[PDB]
Amino acid sequence: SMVYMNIMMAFTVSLVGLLMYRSHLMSSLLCLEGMMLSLFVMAALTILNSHFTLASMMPIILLVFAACEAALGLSLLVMVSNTYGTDYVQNLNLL
Amino acid sequence: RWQEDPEPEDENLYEKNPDSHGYDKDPAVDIWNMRVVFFFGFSIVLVLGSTFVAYLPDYRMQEWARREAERLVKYREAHGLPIMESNCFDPSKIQLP
Amino acid sequence: XXXXXXXXXXXXXXXXXXXXXXXXXXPRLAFVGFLGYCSGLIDNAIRRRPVLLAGLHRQLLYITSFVFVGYYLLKRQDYMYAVRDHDMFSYIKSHXXXXXXXXXXXXXXXXXXX
Amino acid sequence: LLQVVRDHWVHVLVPMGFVFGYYLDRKNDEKLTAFRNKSLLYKRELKPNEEVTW
Amino acid sequence: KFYIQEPPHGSPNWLKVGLTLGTSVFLWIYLIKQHNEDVLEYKRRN
Amino acid sequence: XXXXXXXXXXXXXXXXXXXXXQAERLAIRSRLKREYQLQYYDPSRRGVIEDPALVRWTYARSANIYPNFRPNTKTSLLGALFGIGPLVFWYYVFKTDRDRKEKLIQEGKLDRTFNISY
Amino acid sequence: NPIIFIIILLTIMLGTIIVMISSHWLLVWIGFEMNMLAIIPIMMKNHNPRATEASTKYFLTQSTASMLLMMAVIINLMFSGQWTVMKLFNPMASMLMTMALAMKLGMAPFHFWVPEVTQGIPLSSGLILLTWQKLAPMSVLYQIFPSINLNLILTLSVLSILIGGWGGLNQTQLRKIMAYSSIAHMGWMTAVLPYNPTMTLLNLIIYIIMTSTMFTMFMANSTTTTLSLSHTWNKTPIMTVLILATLLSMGGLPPLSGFMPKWMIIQEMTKNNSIILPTFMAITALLNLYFYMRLTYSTTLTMFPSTNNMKMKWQFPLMKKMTFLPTMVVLSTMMLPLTPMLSV
Amino acid sequence: XXXXXXXXXXXXXXXXXXXXXXXXXXXXXXXXXXXXXXXXXXXXXXXXXXXXXXXXXXXXXXXXXXXXXXXXXXXXXXXXXXXXXXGNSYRLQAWLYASRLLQYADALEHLLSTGQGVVLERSIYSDFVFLEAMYRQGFIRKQCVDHYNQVKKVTICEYLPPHVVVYVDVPVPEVQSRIQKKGNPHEMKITSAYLQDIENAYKGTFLPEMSEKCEVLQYSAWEAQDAEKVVEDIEYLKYDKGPWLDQNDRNLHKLRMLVQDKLEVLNYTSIPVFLPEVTVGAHQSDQVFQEFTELPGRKYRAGYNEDVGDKWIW
Amino acid sequence: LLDLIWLEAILPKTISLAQMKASTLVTNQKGLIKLYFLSFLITILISMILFNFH
Amino acid sequence: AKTVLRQYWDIPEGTECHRKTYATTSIGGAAGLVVSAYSVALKTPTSFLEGVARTGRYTFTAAAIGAIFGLTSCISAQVREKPDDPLNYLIGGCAGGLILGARTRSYGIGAAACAYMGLTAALVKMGQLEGWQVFAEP
Amino acid sequence: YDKRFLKLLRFYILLTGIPVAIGITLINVXXXXXXXXXXXXXXXXXXXXXXXXXXXXXXXXX
Amino acid sequence: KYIIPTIMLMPLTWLSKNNMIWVNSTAHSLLISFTSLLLMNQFGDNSLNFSLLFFSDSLSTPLLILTMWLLPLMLMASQHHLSKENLTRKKLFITMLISLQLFLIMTFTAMELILFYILFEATLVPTLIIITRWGNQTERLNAGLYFLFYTLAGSLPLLVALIYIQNTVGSLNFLMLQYWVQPVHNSWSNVFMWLACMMAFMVKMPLYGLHLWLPKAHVEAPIAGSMVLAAVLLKLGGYGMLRITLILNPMTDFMAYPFIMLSLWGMIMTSSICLRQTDLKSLIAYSSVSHMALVIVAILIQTPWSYMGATALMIAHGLTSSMLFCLANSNYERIHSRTMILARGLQTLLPLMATWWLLASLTNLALPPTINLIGELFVVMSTFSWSNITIILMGVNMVITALYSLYMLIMTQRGKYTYHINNISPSFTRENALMSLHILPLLLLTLNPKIILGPLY
Amino acid sequence: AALQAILYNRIGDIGFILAMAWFLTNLNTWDLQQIFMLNPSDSNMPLIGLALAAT
């Protein structure tokens, strides 16, 4: 309507952020929590304006799962450095 | 290098260790197969089968149509003017256009 | 129909429409029974065992399981085709205007030469 | 008796398969019993035998 | 050969063979009784 | 192909270059015959001899197709005009016969009354 | 590894149940994330330099995809309001919805991760997981088949068989061939969704059974074409006949069960009057046949793969459904024409 | 189905006097073979030395397979007078490497299920000593060794523990005179440089084995033949920082499954690579597979067999 | 000309050109998560701008 | 865009063709830009100097296919009688695929697939009649 | 090898040449054909339509 | 009546003992082939349906009898081959013939188009396994891949064609039901509908364009020479053109006009190449193009006279070209090469087989009325009523049909073979028995060709 | 020598089979007993036919 357009514009920048890769792999895991942050604000405004009360529980569940993927991806980042030296998008073997 | 790949043997029955045969190995199996059941189908399908083919069971109304045509010729010549076909299988059709 | 309208969602058997009578020793059942016997031939090829046909007597499990699942599978087949026909015939009678009949006509058509 | 049955087992199955094939394919006419006697092509009234011919 | 160095399968398990042949009997009776019930249900309705 | 005078014995000189030329041809001819001679006169063989000349002769027509035809230039394109071209040539031959035949059936009959087959 | 591995495998089964039995849009989002936490541990297992590359590649090219799905869920609050898995209502919502599912099923512009992920798995049992995971987002598309723009789903059907039919041609790795065979078969899946939603579930049943048999035939260690070449001339000779039967069915051929997909997909598409699209589907399907054709030459030809080592001891594998499923994968044609009704 | 979920568990009923001992790198003469029989006073299980017919010695058949039934052209007498081009040379060693790996797989399976001490004659880790000694002289080409190193990197890394106790016997360079005194005429008249190269390579084989914190005790020719001295050394030597000490639940479970089945371990040993000394020919392979199927031993294979056993058909 | 070259020439148009188009989808992109995600930027822009649907 | 494609079908109803030539370049140019975007995945050496060099070779050639196709559609229409025909666009399809052999010095390949490109261009122009549909709904 | 083939061929032609010889006598002993207008009672009995040879009716029954 | 006893041949070869096998497969096949000439021959004015549409009756197809004739004949010459290898390899490739015969019986009998399609393509799978394996020379794959990517490339357009007809006009099914079929209005949308129905039977029935499928399969021998006859059975196996053109598109013949001319040039140019060719199997491979091209011309004319010769040619070619391949096989297992020039010598070395070489070569020519004259003559007579210019081109073809077979004779009727020492035994009983079982049915069809040439005859 | 005797005869066959095909298309009887009655005046039959068979 008005406030939604700004946070949708913040989503599009973070969308590019997940599709852009430069040197380190750490940027993606910031953008994974970044994109979930933008979705959380969008969920909070939609539910509260046209009141739900029952469905206001749903973004709290979403916020739990927001870091569920982020914790697993950040733990995968650990094992790549052990096999190599430093985590790099530039450094990959598979074809 | 081939190692084991170089392995080829020329084999021919001809007459050596076969006497006179068609099937490879065993003289007892050869006579009972290549001369008996090989020639049993040669005797049933070709000689006893020749009686059928087209001769005997009429075959798609070939002989029936001859006797059927002859009786229709003599009847139509005695009564009608037109012989067999003139305006057949169409009488008082519902217009044209 | 893809979506249910008359029947209740999530059911193994029909139950609501049971009256149809299932097939008794059908020609279709014999082929599924043959497929149960065929599975009892190829398992002795994977696990190297003497004789495909005259092997172990664990084949009876393979014959029974294919018949048992197949009987319920064929029961679902005859039910779903019947509902398809039931909905189709009811649609024509309810509308009436959608269907039109035309019979007995003599019309000219172009004949091909040679 | 014991030597004859042990020798031939697969040989008996092929003519036995022909009898089973002939019987099963004949039974299909019982499903197609409709229009047994209709119009004038091959229709006659019964005298002694039931339903003319199968 | 007489099965040298102990075979993985002795050949008659009895515990496993008995259940596989046992379950086949259980399945056969269960289907025919439902088949007999289906014929009674079809005659009652139509 | 033949010229004005048929070649059989015409234009031949002894010289020195031709004398060594016959020595070259007879050397290979005897070389390929001796390997046949050792394989022909023995009872232990029984079997048809291969020979590298005849195998390559059959391989010349059945194979060696796609390694060839890489410089097409114009000679290959002229073969296509003699290839699919005759199909276009006969396309106007039969079509003129159809315009002749179809017109005669409708107006001014040409088909005989005795005709009935096909 | 001993106890918890069964639990981890069970959570993928339980995760799909949340997707299958659902009415809420956030509930399926949970179900997709239940798979994310449960596949990646089995992706690693042995811990390899090749496995570390694939596990992160599988994570980043799927978790970001599910995040696009949540946008479409939030647009269902922005527009139309109600949290119900029936219709998307907005055309703007459906575009971000379909492209999110295209990362898992559509494949046509999102195939890139598949060949690297499939080769990266060290276990033969882990190869089943990728072919079984595709069951989850199909149940979503089975619910939201209306409202979605057909112009941008049928492009994910036509182009996917093109890249699937070309992408396997220049690959010798056995896992990579099966990776693009997945893309080839997923192309058919996205084509039935606009034209009659029934049979699309049966398309999976034919596909899953055929693929689950394939990897269980490779329980005897094989990773390349030349390694699977030494199977009849060194190991079990009768095993290659069943590999031949499965490969001849994977490509659409009438005397096998793998023509039953090609039967009804074209049949239902022609009922909606479309000629030019299903013609292109049939010609591109020939390109799919070529991979299996070259892989049947490991079972038919001599090829000389004898090697110095010769096996004498009897093989004892797991083999979960390596006897019941190939029989349904080989000779299901006569007991098949009435089966479309039985699925749904 | 996995049985480790039930009452059966890894590392249970072992540990105390359960570690495996091996006699590796004995130059050429069988000096380690005689002392391995006396080493069975402390350890319960003892296995025979690997040869051309060692995989065929167990497996399923009671009697050993003869020539054509087993590996094609594989004999120690034929390799004694080794000839280049269309010969043994490498194809003996590739079959020998797989046979040592197969008996080790049975030995590790015997160690895990019911804890008993297993003594093995010449380990898989001592195979490259026998290869490189023949490589120094003009016998094996460089391209064949590159094929061997690919098998070396795959087969070894799958198994977690090498050996707890390793016995190395280093004799004098006059070991060729001791080998000539033996009753075997085919083993005699071997190359003097080939036996010396095996002793030189053993010094660069025991040193990397000791560097990995695995216990190794050297025994001299004068200290040889002693049974009480060798048995006391096994109980005295304590494992410190060794690779044998691993996780009981996670590490031991994977190694037990890989060693249980013979087909699972031998599959990695067969490499998909063309080699001159590998026998690639499919035409000879088809006749060899026909003869193995016609053999009275295996024939139908796995438990049930016609005209050899036949206990149950139902 | 015809029987072995020009009538066979229809086949490389569907085989050799197909293999040429195949090589541009297999050997392309030397690994890298970067490269595959660079193409995903365009895919959304095709559906939004280049395609009229929403 | 489909709105650009809708403008194309309104032109052949009359005799005017000067607007038709510009309409084909907009479709042909945009189709080249898609192929130019996927060629970035190949990774260009250095920056901009070779990066824009690969965009130039693809977009200019793809627009040239459309430009000749737009011209040849009306050369066959103005000269001689008869309106829209499958044979009329077949001549137009031949000239479009001819310049692919002019792009790379080989004289064939594109010119070898002159009949292949021409038939496919005619098949789209078969869709002007009601007996052809690309994507169906009912 | 050549002359034996012709003798082995002829042995099996003559073996089934016996019912050929009986086939001629079947025309001789049994009635061949008769053409007459049939009374309305039965259209088919054993054979529906029998003409020329009596062997046609024998094959029509089976 | 026919299916079930044919399926019972599958457990026969597997259950029988190791020494036998070949005796049971040949003897039991001969008694089943007797019953085909016993029951199928009965027909009225219009041939009445057999039973339910699983397998139906024959209206104009006595070509089933030919498949039943080759049912034991293919097992005869495959005795010399396969004998060296294992018993399981023997049992597999006998059952692959039985599976071929199972699907081949299903193709001709079943009066359908929808279920007929999934039996037409279903015959390709067993032949693929047979052709790719047991190849004496190399390039097996340059014939195996060619076997599918020509047929399936043309036949998969039937799925979009046949289903399109039944979705608009009732259902295809019985064909006896098909009076619902209305004449085509001749539209550009209906152009590719006709082409899709034709192209499937334009590959298996070899033209001049897309003909390369055939000679590659014949030169690269499947097993010995008797499995080559199964590929001959697939030429005549594409008989659906007799059913589609007659029923589905009777008004359409304007689009047939260029396709007659494409097959007309597949007569002069196909005979020209078959003169300088080196391979003996290739000389039969290109002669098989011309004989089947005569059928293609006949079908597209659609005159009642052409079908009488077309149906006759299907039976004529199936027993004469297969006879010629057996003669090629009889030299292939003695000389071990397909070379014509190397294997040269009849009567001096092969006394009684030379007379079989004559009768097989004379059948390519127009002999006193056997079946080949009867089959060809109706086509020549039908073409003149179609267009008068035809026999000027068709007469030239009659000159090179002599050169098709006399060149085979001349390069075998020469007292040489100086390089050759093998081929001591000329014919081991069954070798000449194969040749008699191919020619004597043609000699019996001299007396009764009414059984062979019968589309409403 | 034996090949040419058929080769030149088969070029003579071009006319002969053309004379066969013309005979059926013009006259339904096909046999030689017809042409004695209702004989049509045509140059196409004996010239391109019997005269060509006479070579």
From Swiss-Prot, chain B:
The membrane-spanning stretches of this chain are 36-56
Q: What is its main location?
A: mitochondrion
Assembly, per entry: Complex I is composed of 45 different subunits. Interacts with BCAP31.
User: What function is annotated for this protein?
Assistant: Accessory subunit of the mitochondrial membrane respiratory chain NADH dehydrogenase (Complex I), that is believed not to be involved in catalysis. Complex I functions in the transfer of electrons from NADH to the respiratory chain. The immediate electron acceptor for the enzyme is believed to be ubiquinone.
Keyword Transport on this protein? Answer: yes
Instruction: List, as start-end ranges, the regions of compositional bias called Basic and acidic residues.
Output: 13-24
Q: Highest lineage ranks of the organism?
A: Eukaryota, Metazoa, Chordata, Craniata, Vertebrata
- Name by which UniProt lists this protein: NADH dehydrogenase [ubiquinone] 1 beta subcomplex subunit 11, mitochondrial
Entire-sequence positions represented here? 54 to 150 of 154
Region annotation (Disordered) ranges: 1-24
Name its cellular compartments: Mitochondrion inner membrane
**Source organism:** Bos taurus
Membrane topology per record: Single-pass membrane protein
Swiss-Prot record, chain E:
Example of a GO cellular component annotation carried by this entry: respiratory chain complex I
Provide the transmembrane region boundaries. Answer: 14-32
Arranged from A to Z, the UniProt key words for this protein are: Electron transport, Membrane, Mitochondrion, Mitochondrion inner membrane, Respiratory chain, Transit peptide, Transmembrane, Transmembrane helix, Transport
The protein's superkingdom reads Eukaryota
Membrane topology designation? Single-pass membrane protein
Q: Record keywords: Mitochondrion included?
A: yes
Q: Where in the cell is it found?
A: Mitochondrion inner membrane
Query: What biological function has been recorded for the protein in this entry?
Result: Accessory subunit of the mitochondrial membrane respiratory chain NADH dehydrogenase (Complex I), that is believed not to be involved in catalysis. Complex I functions in the transfer of electrons from NADH to the respiratory chain. The immediate electron acceptor for the enzyme is believed to be ubiquinone.
Q: How does it assemble?
A: Complex I is composed of 45 different subunits.
Family assignment from sequence similarity? Belongs to the complex I NDUFC1 subunit family.
Identify this protein by name. Answer: NADH dehydrogenase [ubiquinone] 1 subunit C1, mitochondrial
State the species of origin. Answer: Bos taurus
Q: Which gene encodes it?
A: NDUFC1
Give the stretch of the parent protein shown, with its full length: 28 to 73 of 76
Swiss-Prot record, chain F:
Report how it sits in the membrane.
Single-pass membrane protein
Transmembrane region(s): 75-94
Keyword list (alphabetical) reads: Acetylation, Electron transport, Membrane, Mitochondrion, Mitochondrion inner membrane, Phosphoprotein, Respiratory chain, Transmembrane, Transmembrane helix, Transport
GO CC, sorted alphabetically, is: mitochondrial inner membrane; mitochondrion; respiratory chain complex I
* Localization of this protein: Mitochondrion inner membrane
What family does this chain come from, according to its entry?
Belongs to the complex I NDUFB4 subunit family.
Protein name, as recorded: NADH dehydrogenase [ubiquinone] 1 beta subcomplex subunit 4
Instruction: State the organism named in the record.
Output: Bos taurus
User: Complete protein: which residues are present?
Assistant: 33 to 129 of 129
Swiss-Prot record, chain M:
Give the residue spans that cross the bilayer. Answer: 5-25
Superkingdom, according to UniProt?
Answer: Eukaryota
Q: Where in the cell is it found?
A: Mitochondrion inner membrane
Q: Give the family from UniProt.
A: Belongs to the complex I subunit 5 family.
Q: What does this protein do?
A: Core subunit of the mitochondrial membrane respiratory chain NADH dehydrogenase (Complex I) which catalyzes electron transfer from NADH through the respiratory chain, using ubiquinone as an electron acceptor. Essential for the catalytic activity and assembly of complex I.
Subunit details for this protein? Answer: Core subunit of respiratory chain NADH dehydrogenase (Complex I) which is composed of 45 different subunits.
**What protein am I looking at?**
NADH-ubiquinone oxidoreductase chain 5
The source organism is Bos taurus
**Included stretch of the parent chain:** 167 to 221 of 606
